[PDB]
Design an enzyme around this catalytic site. Structure first.
Site, short mmCIF file in Angstrom:
data_model
loop_
_atom_site.label_atom_id
_atom_site.label_comp_id
_atom_site.label_asym_id
_atom_site.label_seq_id
_atom_site.Cartn_x
_atom_site.Cartn_y
_atom_site.Cartn_z
N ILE A 62 5.37 -4.41 -5.65
CA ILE A 62 4.14 -4.80 -5.84
C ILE A 62 3.51 -3.72 -6.86
O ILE A 62 3.48 -2.64 -6.66
CB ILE A 62 3.30 -5.04 -4.52
CG1 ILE A 62 4.15 -5.95 -3.55
CG2 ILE A 62 1.93 -5.56 -5.11
CD1 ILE A 62 4.29 -7.37 -4.09
N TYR A 65 4.92 -0.21 -8.28
CA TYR A 65 6.02 0.12 -7.66
C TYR A 65 7.24 -0.68 -8.18
O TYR A 65 8.46 -0.50 -7.77
CB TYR A 65 5.83 -0.09 -5.94
CG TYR A 65 5.19 0.92 -5.20
CD1 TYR A 65 3.83 1.12 -5.49
CD2 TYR A 65 5.77 1.65 -4.40
CE1 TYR A 65 3.23 2.20 -5.01
CE2 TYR A 65 5.29 2.62 -3.71
CZ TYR A 65 3.75 2.86 -3.81
OH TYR A 65 3.48 4.07 -3.23
N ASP A 147 11.53 0.20 2.35
CA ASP A 147 10.57 0.86 1.10
C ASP A 147 11.29 0.93 0.00
O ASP A 147 12.49 1.14 -0.16
CB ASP A 147 10.29 2.10 1.50
CG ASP A 147 8.96 2.41 2.44
OD1 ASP A 147 8.64 1.09 2.90
OD2 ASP A 147 8.47 3.19 2.67
N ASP A 149 10.48 2.64 -2.92
CA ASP A 149 10.16 4.28 -3.21
C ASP A 149 11.32 5.15 -3.04
O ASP A 149 11.02 6.32 -2.51
CB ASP A 149 8.95 4.71 -2.99
CG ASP A 149 8.50 4.93 -1.59
OD1 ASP A 149 9.06 4.14 -0.86
OD2 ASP A 149 7.92 5.88 -1.10
N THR A 181 2.27 10.81 15.21
CA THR A 181 1.25 9.84 14.61
C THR A 181 0.75 8.49 15.15
O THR A 181 0.57 7.79 14.10
CB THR A 181 0.98 10.16 13.33
OG1 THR A 181 2.01 9.47 12.41
CG2 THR A 181 0.76 11.56 12.88
N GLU A 239 3.27 0.42 10.24
CA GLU A 239 4.33 1.44 10.88
C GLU A 239 3.57 1.68 12.25
O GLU A 239 4.41 1.86 13.08
CB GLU A 239 4.46 2.81 10.20
CG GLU A 239 4.89 3.77 10.73
CD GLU A 239 5.00 5.22 9.74
OE1 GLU A 239 4.41 5.94 9.76
OE2 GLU A 239 6.05 5.06 9.05
O1 LIG Z 1 1.24 -0.60 -4.20
C1 LIG Z 1 2.22 -0.76 -3.52
C2 LIG Z 1 1.91 0.00 -2.38
C3 LIG Z 1 3.25 -0.34 -1.42
N1 LIG Z 1 4.29 -0.89 -1.96
C4 LIG Z 1 5.34 -1.36 -0.91
O2 LIG Z 1 5.03 -0.69 0.22
C5 LIG Z 1 6.04 0.40 0.77
C6 LIG Z 1 5.35 1.29 1.57
O3 LIG Z 1 4.45 2.05 0.89
P1 LIG Z 1 4.67 3.54 0.45
O4 LIG Z 1 6.06 3.77 0.11
O5 LIG Z 1 3.58 3.87 -0.72
O6 LIG Z 1 4.19 4.21 1.91
P2 LIG Z 1 4.72 5.56 2.18
O7 LIG Z 1 3.61 6.66 1.84
O8 LIG Z 1 6.17 6.17 1.79
C7 LIG Z 1 4.74 5.55 4.05
C8 LIG Z 1 5.36 7.09 4.64
O9 LIG Z 1 4.77 8.08 3.95
C9 LIG Z 1 3.51 8.43 4.67
C10 LIG Z 1 3.10 9.57 3.76
O10 LIG Z 1 2.44 9.16 2.61
C11 LIG Z 1 3.40 8.74 6.01
O11 LIG Z 1 4.63 9.78 6.24
C12 LIG Z 1 4.08 7.49 6.82
O12 LIG Z 1 4.39 7.70 7.98
C13 LIG Z 1 5.42 6.88 6.20
O13 LIG Z 1 5.50 5.72 6.77
C14 LIG Z 1 6.42 0.74 -0.61
O14 LIG Z 1 7.81 1.53 -0.60
C15 LIG Z 1 6.67 -0.54 -1.40
O15 LIG Z 1 7.95 -1.21 -0.90
C16 LIG Z 1 4.18 -1.79 -3.06
O16 LIG Z 1 5.10 -2.26 -3.33
N2 LIG Z 1 2.99 -1.43 -3.85
MN LIG Z 2 7.67 5.04 0.93
#
Ligand SMILES: O=c1ccn([C@@H]2O[C@H](COP(=O)(O)OP(=O)(O)C[C@H]3O[C@H](CO)[C@H](O)[C@H](O)[C@H]3O)[C@@H](O)[C@H]2O)c(=O)[nH]1
Ligand SMILES: [Mn+2]
Ligand SMILES: O=c1ccn([C@@H]2O[C@H](COP(=O)(O)OP(=O)(O)C[C@H]3O[C@H](CO)[C@H](O)[C@H](O)[C@H]3O)[C@@H](O)[C@H]2O)c(=O)[nH]1
Ligand SMILES: [Mn+2]
Lengths: 282, 282
Positions: A62, A65, A147, A149, A181, A239
């Site tokens: 989205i 990403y 995910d 990313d 957390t 999460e």
């Molecule tokens: O604009 C967007 C936003 C999100 N997404 C979608 O949502 C997923 C999760 O978000 P993100 O990877 O930023 O979280 P993370 O930051 O990787 C979430 C992870 O890292 C955190 C630190 O930033 C903490 O460690 C947490 O515990 C862990 O889950 C992303 O991979 C995309 O598939 C999208 O498509 N467009």
């Molecule tokens: Mn991620």
């Protein structure tokens, strides 16, 4: 019904020799914890090919990403369930930005348009449950929800498949539960007290059978709606809810942090023999 | 559908601390190998009680082996699935010689008369499959099939339950596969070559879901009939066929020799923290 395995020549497992002595390889509820050296992939590939297993992989891309899709998909082709049937489900607000990635035989990709919106990450539970319910039940045996990313660097295969799995968050696998957390406010549906918790599971890699994944995603969506009605947003969004669910519904496998790693942040510790699925700079 | 576990206070599992470092606790096909220290029985009891699990236990007591029933049943009352629903099925040629054993609540015993006949041991597969098929499917969730010349000394509980399990024979758990007493004649349906085999499973303790046990016992019965038509009798009778079946259909748990031990013959090695189900002199 499961047909017989063929004759296979492989090393005899020896009861008085652990595969791994440095790590826990089974949970206290008798779920395998998947590390390199704990499985013979040839046996598992046979088992799952004899059932003509189809694995669905969901990924959300989205807004900005969408830029992560090319590497995600190209590396999934190299490393994810190779030899098995795979159906990718790419959920996006920009269908035209999905890159044209060449797929191996028995693999397909569907682009599913959604509305763009913390909330982006949260609404995955609804989109996975309601109403991809019908489609997933008809088309795949297991769902894997990740995910975007990220990139695959090494084998991620049928060793992960089971009715319900979570993945150890790479920042917390050596931590005491008080440090996890988890959502700590009793007013949230995701609340876990300081004296409860098995593991901290990463929201970016879970899965299971279609039925179990639809149960998990439905429960998490419902719990998030309750929180929204009560004016509270869990500390780590979906999460936090995933962690609550997996505390009360124990997963039947747990993936080691081989399956969700950040080398920039955490390096390459001896205990990780392989880095399979890893963070890309964002 | 599985309801949520309640809040429970118990020690946190730590990923970087094995439960057991002296033994293999997971097979190469990711089936737990059940040893003391690998499971939290409070978690497992919760899981299985929330499903109102009923366990059937089959035992054959033909000819002089009726003498073993009193101790078998009295000790099963002390140690086998206590707190869960249990249905004993006692197969015998002498219904009047079955001792009157006092049962705990939620436990029942049925006496099933059979015709007396190596062949006594073999024909268990037919009797379990054909035609207790209908009855077991209606009455229990899991079946556990054991030898009668035995006593329970310690806990045998829901940690064993799974779709299909076998038990490591206490004479062979430290042996190389060439030493296993598999049927070695290619003319037998039970034939296993010297370079194949995971474990040597004991014919006196196997089980699983009703469906999986009926599959196993049907297959073993069919294979024994083929052998009889070809004028060959496997070296260890039903146990040889059980081993062939479990080679080609991998069990989803394996029980350690805690679950089938002979102290007179083998003593009490350090690697056995508990002796749960043990041979009686015969
Ligand atoms: O604009 C967007 C936003 C999100 N997404 C979608 O949502 C997923 C999760 O978000 P993100 O990877 O930023 O979280 P993370 O930051 O990787 C979430 C992870 O890292 C955190 C630190 O930033 C903490 O460690 C947490 O515990 C862990 O889950 C992303 O991979 C995309 O598939 C999208 O498509 N467009
Ligand atoms: Mn991620
Ligand atoms: O007249 C009978 C004869 C049998 N039975 C029934 O069949 C069961 C198996 O036989 P047994 O225990 O003698 O074999 P075991 O000798 O324990 C069979 C075991 O030990 C062998 C050595 O004697 C080998 O170690 C073999 O590997 C192992 O399976 C017995 O427990 C009874 O439920 C019965 O009811 N009446
Ligand atoms: Mn015996």
């Amino acid at each position: 019904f499961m047909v017989s395995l063929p004759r296979m020549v492989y090393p005899q497992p020896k009861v008085l020799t652990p595969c791994r002595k440095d790590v826990l390889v089974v949970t206290p509820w008798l779920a395998p914890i998947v590390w390199e050296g704990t499985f013979n992939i040839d046996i598992l590939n046979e088992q799952f090919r004899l059932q003509n297993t189809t694995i669905g992989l969901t990924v959300f891309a989205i807004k900005k990403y969408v830029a992560f899709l090319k590497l995600f998909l190209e590396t999934a082709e190299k490393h994810f369930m190779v030899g098995h049937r795979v159906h990718y489900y790419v959920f996006t607000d920009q269908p035209a930005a999905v890159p044209r990635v060449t797929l191996g035989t028995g693999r397909q990709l569907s682009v599913l348009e959604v509305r763009a919106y913390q909330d982006v990450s949260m609404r995955r539970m609804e989109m996975i449950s309601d109403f991809c319910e019908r489609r997933f039940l008809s088309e795949v045996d297991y769902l894997v929800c990740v995910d975007v990313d990220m990139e695959f660097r090494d084998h991620v295969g049928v060793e992960i498949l089971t009715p319900l799995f979570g993945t150890l968050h790479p920042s917390f696998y050596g931590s005491s539960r008080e440090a996890f957390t988890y959502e700590r406010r009793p007013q949230s549906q995701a609340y876990i007290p300081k004296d409860e918790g098995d593991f901290y599971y990463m929201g970016g890699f879970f899965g299971g059978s279609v039925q179990e994944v639809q149960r998990l995603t439905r429960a998490c969506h419902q719990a998030m709606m309750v929180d929204q009605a009560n004016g509270i947003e869990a500390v780590w969004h979906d999460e936090s809810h995933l962690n609550k669910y997996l505390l009360r519904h124990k997963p039947t496998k747990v993936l080691s942090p081989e399956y969700l790693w950040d080398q920039q942040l955490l390096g390459w510790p001896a205990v990780l023999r392989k880095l399979r699925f890893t963070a890309v700079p964002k």
